[PDB]
Structures are given as C-alpha cells and as structure tokens.
C-alpha cells in the first residue's frame, strides 16, 4: 500500500502474502481511502477468520470505473483489462493519487488498453501488444485505420476532475484456501482443555462440544478429517465429540390428582447434567423398584410409572 509506484491495469501487479498476519481493522479504521468495499466477507470480522495466503493485487484506474471493479460488472477494462468471477470473495481497495501522481501536461505514464478479441476470464491478465485488427485484411503491422495498437494513456492532469482524477486500486483475495492455514488475523491463543463442552476456533473453524484424545493417525500434511456430512471431528492432538443433546418428557399422574411430576431425559447419562437410569436415559423424581405391575405410563425399555 505504501508502494511508491503502482503497475498498470493492463500489467496490474499482484503479490502472494503468506506466513504473516494482518491487523486489517486499520485498513478499515484508517478511513483515509475512498472505498474499502468488501464482498465475500465482513470487513469488521477479519480478525478471527484466517487463510493460507493472500493474492494482493494492485492497479490504478479512474474513480469513474472503480465501480467497474465489481464481479459480474461489465466494463471495457472490466471486460478487456481485469476480470472478476461471478463468485469472487475479497475486498476492493482504491484511493485517489491525484496528489501523488498528477503533473501539468497529463502524466503519460499509466498505460491502459481498449480492445480485445474476447473478454478476459477472472484474474486472467493480458499484456499483449499485438496490433488490434478490425479489418478483414490483416495489416500483419501498419497501424492507422482498421489496424490498431490497443492501448491509450490516461495522462492525468493536475486539474482533472473526479471521474478523471486518478485513484489507485488494490484488490485482495482471501479465497478460503483452507487446506493449511498460514496467514491469519490478530488473536490471542488460549489454553486447550478436554472433557468439558467448550466452543472453539481451531485454525479458523468454529464449533463446540467436548475435546477428547484422538487415537487415529494423520499425515504430515493432514490438518483435519471429517466424518460424514462434512462434519469435522478432529483437529490440531484430538478427536471431537458434541456435548449431550437430549430430549425432555414430563410425567404425571394427571393433574386432577397432583402437581408433582417426573423428569425424563433421553439417551443420556444423568451423571452428565433422586436418580434412576435406563436404556431410555435417566429419570429425576422417581424410584426404581422391585415390584411388578401393569403398565400405565410408559417410558420405554421396560420402565413404566404410576402412583
């Protein structure tokens, strides 16, 4: 961002960024720039997530077209210079440099293109310098009419207006590159725990439950495996398990007799919230007995109840 010089929209320079961290909120809370429009993610959320790299992309255009910097948005530049997908993810950053790049005469430096035989696919730069041809007869290479060099020079003026004031653009890619995580936000690690239902963010993945020791093996690259439904059950070592989800049935003599009641708890081990366990769970408010009757109120697995 402090890079003095910026490449051109037709040679829009780009950079990988891994093995690092990003106190992004600054870029949001600096406010020194015009646009920090963030698709894909929530600008005010980029501290807890994280990724493995960032394709940092920087180019320059007129503010007139930063709107052209929008996925699925049509724009000659956006059509023949720089393309975004229909399913991009990331944030667009672009800012005026009239103060830093303008000079009397039209700064003829920042070169840009007009034509093409086709529209570029996303992130598919094109540097070509071949002579654009609109005439059936190929010039092979005498530019002029129906035989064209493809690029024009903005030539920004110290006075030029807003839509012609030059705004620098930087574009960030956070493409949920999940396999390992290497580039991450600012956060304070915490001490692991087991045998207690706890929320978690292991390398960017939110869940909750209990954390018990794994017994299986992974490989020197493997970060996690999921059992079915794409449900992770181990991370970096541990196996995962939810914490108990059970059902609640209330038992009674029927009101007309009383207001006293029984508590059912399903498929649970009531040590894990007088008492009584079954193949149906555990029961709070009743007594296991040794007598023998007919079944009035059924629980299951053999356990009925009455007065």
């Amino acid at each position: 961002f402090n890079a003095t010089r910026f490449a051109s929209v037709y040679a829009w320079n780009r950079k990988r960024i891994s093995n690092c961290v990003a106190d992004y909120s600054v870029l949001y809370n600096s406010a020194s720039f015009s646009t920090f429009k963030c698709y894909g993610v929530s600008p005010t959320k980029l501290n807890d997530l994280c990724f493995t790299n960032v394709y940092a992309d920087s180019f320059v255009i007129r503010g007139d077209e930063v709107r052209q910097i929008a996925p699925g948005q049509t724009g000659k530049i956006a059509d023949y210079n720089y393309k975004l997908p229909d399913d991009f993810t990331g944030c667009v950053i672009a800012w005026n440099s009239n103060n830093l790049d303008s000079k009397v005469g039209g700064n003829y430096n920042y070169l840009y293109r007009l034509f093409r035989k086709s529209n570029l696919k996303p992130f598919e730069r094109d540097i070509s310098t071949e002579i654009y041809q609109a005439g059936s007869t190929p010039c092979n290479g005498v530019e002029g009419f129906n035989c064209y060099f493809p690029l024009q020079s903005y030539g920004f003026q110290p006075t030029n207006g807003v839509g012609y004031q030059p705004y620098r653009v930087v574009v960030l890619s956070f493409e949920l590159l999940h396999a390992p995580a290497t580039v991450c936000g600012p956060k304070k690690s915490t001490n692991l725990v087991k045998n207690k239902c706890v929320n978690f963010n292991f390398n960017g993945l939110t869940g909750t439950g209990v954390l018990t020791e794994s017994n299986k093996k992974f490989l020197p690259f493997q970060q996690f495996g999921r059992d079915i439904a794409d449900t992770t059950d181990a991370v970096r070592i541990l196996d995962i398990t939810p914490c108990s989800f059970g059902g609640v049935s209330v038992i009674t003599p029927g009101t007309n007799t009383s207001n006293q009641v029984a508590v059912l708890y399903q498929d649970v081990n009531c040590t894990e919230v007088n008492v009584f366990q079954t193949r149906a769970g555990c029961l709070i408010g009743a007594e296991h007995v040794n007598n023998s009757y007919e079944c009035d109120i059924p629980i299951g697995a053999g356990i009925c109840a009455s007065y």
Partner: nanobody
Amino acid sequence: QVQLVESGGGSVQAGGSLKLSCAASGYASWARKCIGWFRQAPGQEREGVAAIFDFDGSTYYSDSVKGRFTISGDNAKNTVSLQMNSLLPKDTAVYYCTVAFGTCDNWYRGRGDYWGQGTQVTVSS
C-alpha cells in the same frame, strides 16, 4: 470517421498569445498517434506546424510555431491546443486540424493526413 474539431480561429493583432484547440472524443484512441496542424496560405499551401504523440509527450513543432506556439492536448478531455503565443502576423491564414497516423514521422508528409475544416487564423497587425 476521424474528425478534427477545430477551435481558436479568427483574426488577431500581430504579436499575441492564444490557445487554439483540436479535439476527438468517444473515439477510443487506436491507440495513440501524433496530433498537430498545418497552415495553408490564401495563395500558398499548408505548412507543417507541429506534431505531438497522442497521449504521449513526444511532439513535433514548426520553426515558426516552435518558438511562440505550443501544441498541448488532453486525451481525457480528448483535445489538443497549439498555444497561439506571440501571434506573428504571418499567422494570417486558415489553420487546419491534422490527424497524423500511428507514426509521428509520417505526418511530415501529411498527404493521407486527416483534417479539420480549417480555422481561418489571420494574425492582423
């Protein structure tokens, strides 16, 4: 299809400064030429006044204009301007927009050159 909107014509005392203009817009520069003018004479033909490489600083200038006139334009604004400074009286003739082609030297010939109707520019005295 290549038009040359002229501006700045008319009479002027001998020894003045001015800004004439030549503009092309909505054209999608293909991609960058040199741009300048010529000067025909009521009796004599046109003269090679100057050139300037579209969207580029490189330029040409005539011995007369090269000292008291400067051709300056804005492709963002899509025009050019040969500053009519010092307005020599000899500058008494209709001045013509001239579209030099992809090459800057070619204009030196000027035959295929595109033109604007021609701003009559008499430098009166």
